[PDB]
Design a binder for this molecule. Structure first.
Ligand code: FAD
Ligand code: FAD
Lengths: 573, 573, 104, 52
């Protein structure tokens, strides 16, 4: 018996933990995955000395924990087997593929992560706010009020994640890019640092935020928390919440301890599902909400008819550039140079404080030192100079999010031929109109690796605005990236596979009114009809958004937690 | 002040910990890497429910922690940059390459792993014994005595690692392969299960051994060890051991706490280096043993002249096969089949205990169940059937180690087209003659990511036996693999990049006599001349070996630990 | 649909085709050798504005075909090499080889 | 294929690609010497590699 139970230990789950363990509830949290992030439970895997000295290698950590959601049956022809080897007569169901999935209407790139801390153990930590156009209303007919509430919620969310916008302010590459872009779009667009959940510790080490940052996930009571009550149970698959006959309350959470193989049931007053956009929906449909199986409109669901419909995922375009000759020369524009590199008479000098210096003394000092200490190196940028982290946020005239940066998650065998200091990544993210015909559904025959109903997508980017904007987005990336340099061969401008972007939303969408707004949960994230069932995550977001959704989902959880504290009484300790 | 200090937390380091913490020494161990394996410190990363349900993904975990030792300057031509982008006039030193390294005499595949538990957090857990031909002598002129000692040492080593040979005995694929090979080579070669440091927990879960298995790496005293004394310090780079003027004893270990940036010195009575074959040699050469810089025979080292010479690494050949039609039909040879799959009259039956049954009832039952429960599936092998794990050990008439199996570390984007149940991996490993001209050396100008002398290889597989055997090895793999099925397209027979195999040996080699045997340490693994300095690891092994070296290195550490216990007195507690 | 945009290149003295006095080609003639880079200045700016134009204009007709993404081709693949024996009125003033009748 | 069959490259620089998975028994280069009709005079970084 707990006061509250949480399914999932991602940062949205941890938002609920932090709020509710702190309010004095007896909390239990289960995760289907295991603790594997070192002694700080649920922390960012990027935060080791070894990874920030070899950041190129972290792509492999991310790849190692992205398990594809739905993989269609494979139809590749292999006709150079030896005559003696067993050979197929058909393309039969092999290697865990999903025979329900149409390869041409899939989110082939969608994947899930089963570890403690969830995807926040590997994420890129960008946490922009949504402007009105991207955000669901929290207050009808009172825009300035709706604005205040979101400002209040986001401000707390930024606290929990330790969101900041100046962690890269000392980077020559970052400023080089930022300044050129501002200059080029003078009074048509604004550029700034990407808001990032991150704390710099030194010039060569950044403590990337994660679930741990939100809530440290240590069992309580403990010494630094002697009146709080929290237990985390890793390696527990949660399978069904049990409805009462009235469909007014949840009575139990049914679980599978993966290590012993035993199943149990768990009672709480308050049930919170934060298993992610896909696995929330799976858990619910496994529990009698929505509809199991291939959509059949001639049998409507009894509960939550909009569950798994109106799903959104963002179009992503990508390239990388090599920094222009012009920009590179500009780095060292303040330097007077005498002699020829490599002789003892060679000299690179600047005049501090000189009025006609285009850069600050700190920048000049770095450049001078690098050029004198490394006279074999043909570039003015210091070896350890931190990466760019630039954005122009979504606007109506440019309704896409942009990151102009360096991401651990590169999409191909990485280059060694071109100097890393010249390379900038470009990622533009489009907003997707939510549509009823775009669905995530669960097979009533096929099951996944945990013996749950197999997830299946039926998705295409909507015709209309979504398609036009995506193409205008691609074109924008081409136009804007040219200002900084030419495309890097092998990273030419391209749309990424659908869902690789991992910003799936709308799978258990929020709204004021279940029928009128075609939704699943209300603005307290409570499941309509149910007193004690709450959903947290990107699944909640009902709007077409381009920016990274996590901070938004977090803000919604905070408001959800206000409701719980005002409506349920913690047990005595 | 400690009684003993150990550098490195790999399983060889942990062998020293286990022996010495258990003998009652005050032990400290430092690792340059960090704890990141979940709550069991130093354990196998493969031991999560999620990885053994998605084993294909573990390749990414291994890749994420293999940092290449020496990467030559890159000379690839990129001539499709945009005219505007900064373009090189030369192939200058970019992206951490090593300008000292000749690309044509490198071990390009050699890599290191900096995490707590070392490479044992990701290794494949094969732990064969070496036969006399592969093993260094521990006793001169008394072969039967030398045999007994090694039998004694290996038997303990197998205990520590939990080595077993029956963990896969229930696998249809494993037995299918094993039995065919035995049959084919009848009375010319013997096949058995690869000895593996592993404990099966269930039919779908194997607890893979690691450093943790050897020693749990928890700080002591603690409740289950209240009179023992051990501390582990992660994120500490050890840089130099300090010699006394006499070169008879080590006086301190010099360290760098990576998290605070501060340097300290550490006193112990006994210093143990187990940082791996490369990083032991680096630590030593950084400390005035051997020779820093490009080999210069006209300036001999003062100490340990053979340090970094005579290095061995094994030739590795690889392919994968698709199981023959014949073998696949044999699986179901005992089945009577009526009707046609997919109708309710279809029937697969066998007669238990029937004299003419070629397989045991358990095998038949599995096959019958699979064929009746999955009538859409064209193969008689059950979905969860464990992988093959077969070997014929090195002999004189076949002087190579062989693994006929399924390895998490596949060498290419993996297939989805061919059913996984049909696929077997083939890895044959050759022995390399140790030669003086084959060297690992450290630059006196270039430094690595931890500001230590940059490692550089000068290696070629020796002409003579080594080259002939390697080619006869390749041919053997072709001949033997054909017995089981044809090559899988995309995994055709090939030599792997030198050192990818990660069995590097001989870098601080063991022998009776420093000059006569051209070696660094004696049979107690003590550095010649030095009372209190010991080396552990594959670096010690002075012979040409084909089998996987870790259990051998462990046995040597055990004997090293006998010496220490008989020669140094633990402090009072 | 294929999209090919072709830029103009400023002629420069330092951009040269020359022939080895030691190395010979398959017909035992002096081996051809290039010393070429696209000129800084207008040539480089125009080439990049050209790439951008192709992106902007091609979008009007449809999205890029995967495997044929926008890219600069290897120098000279285009096979429009010019200026190697260039024409002009006056040999010294116009730095040239042949006159307007193409006579040397 | 007809076009490719009649375009002979004008100047091909000496090749520097590393092949380190030869069998130990096979003849192996110690240098990137002039092979297969390459032109040692040509700087790979200032070429018209596509000219034919
Ligand atoms: C992978 C990734 C994600 C990512 C990113 C780049 C990459 C490479 N960049 C980010 C960006 O810069 N910022 C942005 O806002 N998001 C970014 N993302 C996405 C981010 O990681 C996710 O949006 C965020 O993690 C969502 O958080 P939430 O807490 O909602 O979900 P979760 O992290 O997926 O964790 C859910 C967990 O629950 C578990 N689970 C799943 N099913 C069950 C069941 N049945 N029972 C018990 N537990 C369950 C998981 O194992 C998991 O930990
Ligand atoms: C990666 C791998 C290795 C492997 C294998 C397959 C793969 C993919 N398969 C194995 C096989 O089946 N069996 C076989 O016997 N070996 C197999 N291997 C090899 C195995 O992992 C290694 O042989 C074994 O781990 C060697 O153990 P040892 O304890 O000698 O070395 P280590 O694991 O590399 O750990 C050394 C550590 O010390 C650290 N370090 C390095 N430098 C320093 C300094 N300067 N200061 C402090 N610490 C240092 C490391 O971080 C490390 O943990």
């Amino acid at each position: 018996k707990y006061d509250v139970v949480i399914v999932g230990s991602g940062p949205i789950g941890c938002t609920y933990a932090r709020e509710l363990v702190g309010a004095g509830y007896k909390v239990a949290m289960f995760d289907i995955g295991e603790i594997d992030s070192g002694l700080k439970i649920g922390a960012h895997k990027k935060n080791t000395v070894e990874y920030q000295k070899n950041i190129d290698k972290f792509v492999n950590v991310i790849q190692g924990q992205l398990m594809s959601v739905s993989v269609p049956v494979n139809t590749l022809v292999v006709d150079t087997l030896s005559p003696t080897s067993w050979q197929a007569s058909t393309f039969f169901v092999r290697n865990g593929s999903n025979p329900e999935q149409d390869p041409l209407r899939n989110l082939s790139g969608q994947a899930v992560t089963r570890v403690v801390g969830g995807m926040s153990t590997h994420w890129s930590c960008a946490t922009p706010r949504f402007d009105r156009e991207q955000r669901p209303l929290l207050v009808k007919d009172d825009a300035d009020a709706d604005d205040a509430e979101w400002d209040r919620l986001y401000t707390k969310a930024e606290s929990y994640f330790q969101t900041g916008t100046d962690q890269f302010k000392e980077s020559i590459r970052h400023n080089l890019v930022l300044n050129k872009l501002t200059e080029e779009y003078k009074g048509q667009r604004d550029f700034q640092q990407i808001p990032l959940a991150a704390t710099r510790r030194s010039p060569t080490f950044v403590e990337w935020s994660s679930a741990n940052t939100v809530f440290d996930l240590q069992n309580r009571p403990n010494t630094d928390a002697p009146e709080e009550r929290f237990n985390l149970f890793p390696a527990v698959a949660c399978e069904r919440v049990v409805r009462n006959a009235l469909n007014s309350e949840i009575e139990s959470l049914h679980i599978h301890d993966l290590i012993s193989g035993d199943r149990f049931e768990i009672k709480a007053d308050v049930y919170v599902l934060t298993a992610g956009a896909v696995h929330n929906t799976q858990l619910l449909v496994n529990s009698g909400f929505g509809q199991l199986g291939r959509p059949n409109p001639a049998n409507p669901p009894e509960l939550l008819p909009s569950l798994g419909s109106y799903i959104t995922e963002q179009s992503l375009v990508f390239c990388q550039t090599v920094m222009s000759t012009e920009l590179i020369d500009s780095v060292k524009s303040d330097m007077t140079i005498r002699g020829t590199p490599g002789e003892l008479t060679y000299s690179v000098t600047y005049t501090p404080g000189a009025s006609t210096n285009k850069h600050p003394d700190w920048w000049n000092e770095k450049v001078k030192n690098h050029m004198m200490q490394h006279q074999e190196d043909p570039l003015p940028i210091p070896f350890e100079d931190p990466e760019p982290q630039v954005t122009t946020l979504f606007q109506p005239s440019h309704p896409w999010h942009t990151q102009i940066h360096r991401d651990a998650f590169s999409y191909g065998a990485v280059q060694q031929s071109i100097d890393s200091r010249l390379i900038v990544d470009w990622r533009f993210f489009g907003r997707t109109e939510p549509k009823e015909e775009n669905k995530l559904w669960f097979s009533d025959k096929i099951t996944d690796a945990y013996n749950m109903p197999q997830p299946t997508f039926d998705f295409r980017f909507p015709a209309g605005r979504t398609s036009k904007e995506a193409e205008d987005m691609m074109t924008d990336m081409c136009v804007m990236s040219a200002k900084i340099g030419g495309f890097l061969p092998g990273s030419l401008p391209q749309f990424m596979e659908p869902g690789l972007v991992l910003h799936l939303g709308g799978t258990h969408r929020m709204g004021f009114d279940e029928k009128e707004d075609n939704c699943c949960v209300n603005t307290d994230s409570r499941v309509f009809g149910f007193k004690n069932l709450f959903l947290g995550g990107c699944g909640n977001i009902p709007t077409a958004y381009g920016a990274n959704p996590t901070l938004t989902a977090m803000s919604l959880a905070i408001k959800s937690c206000e409701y719980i504290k005002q409506n349920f009484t913690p047990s005595p300790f």
